[PDB]
Design a protein around this ligand. Structure first.
Ligand SMILES: N=C(N)c1ccc(CNC(=O)[C@@H]2CCCN2C(=O)COC2CCCCC2)cc1
Ligand SMILES: [Ca+2]
Length: 223
């Protein structure tokens, strides 16, 4: 997260870190046994880490639970990042509490101009690299589909939306992948892609969660 601020310990209790010996992606707890993340975050040997603030310091509120299974969207296309969404099941049910909470799935989509919260432990530099150890937060509006497509002609699908600032300076970035975009108290996006980070006229591109709610619900009910 570039141009953001320190969230504050566990103020984003639905935020998870995916760990394979190191943090490599964000995700979102949607109930005691299930996490939503980006398809591009897929890999074997994944451990879900809940209730984190500093990912390099054990602070006493964490729950580490291995993944029993991953389900990448059936139509995920890695070449274009269309349908960049995946579900991860926990080996054991998380013990939900103040610091470890689920985020509600949308009942509807969200409109351009809506303010959202994006968070993660990804790079905080626009040029160059610096990873924070605590969680960073960014307030960012959903952008019109037409400024999204003009930034990335022929690259935006109906399963994507842009959010951010066209002037630059404020954006998500590498390491924020798979993390939540929360608008009007629901999970409306997943950190997916972008050209660089926080660059002018290159806003962040997010998976459009409201399109996948039936798939998520059907998939978690049968797995
Ligand atoms: N908001 C941002 N500026 C932002 C930019 C990048 C990321 C991290 N995501 C990535 O690095 C993703 C995952 C793997 C391929 N990739 C890419 O961004 C690179 O290429 C994609 C290919 C499909 C068409 C768009 C370009 C996260 C955030
Ligand atoms: Ca920790």
């Amino acid at each position: 997260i570039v141009g953001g601020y320190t969230c504050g310990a566990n103020t984003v209790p639905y935020q998870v870190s995916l760990n394979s010996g190191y943090h490599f992606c964000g995700g979102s707890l949607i109930n005691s046994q299930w996490v939503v993340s980006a398809a591009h975050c897929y890999k074997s040997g994944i451990q879900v880490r809940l209730g984190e603030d500093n990912i390099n310091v054990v602070e006493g509120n964490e729950q580490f639970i291995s993944a029993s299974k991953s389900i990448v969207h059936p139509s995920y296309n890695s070449n274009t990042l269309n349908n960049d969404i995946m579900l991860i099941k926990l080996k054991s049910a998380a013990s939900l509490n103040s610091r470890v909470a689920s985020i509600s799935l949308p009942t509807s989509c969200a409109s351009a101009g809506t303010q959202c919260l994006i968070s993660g432990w990804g790079n905080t530099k626009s040029s160059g690299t610096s990873y924070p150890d605590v969680l960073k937060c960014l307030k960012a509006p959903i952008l019109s589909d037409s400024s999204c497509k003009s930034a990335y002609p022929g690259q935006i699908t109906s399963n994507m939306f842009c959010a951010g600032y066209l002037e630059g300076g404020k954006d998500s970035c590498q390491g924020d992948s798979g993390g939540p975009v929360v608008c009007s108290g629901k999970l409306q996006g997943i950190v997916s892609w972008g050209s660089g980070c926080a660059q002018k006229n290159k806003p962040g591109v997010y998976t459009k969660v409201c399109n996948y709610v039936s798939w998520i619900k059907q998939t978690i009910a049968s797995n």
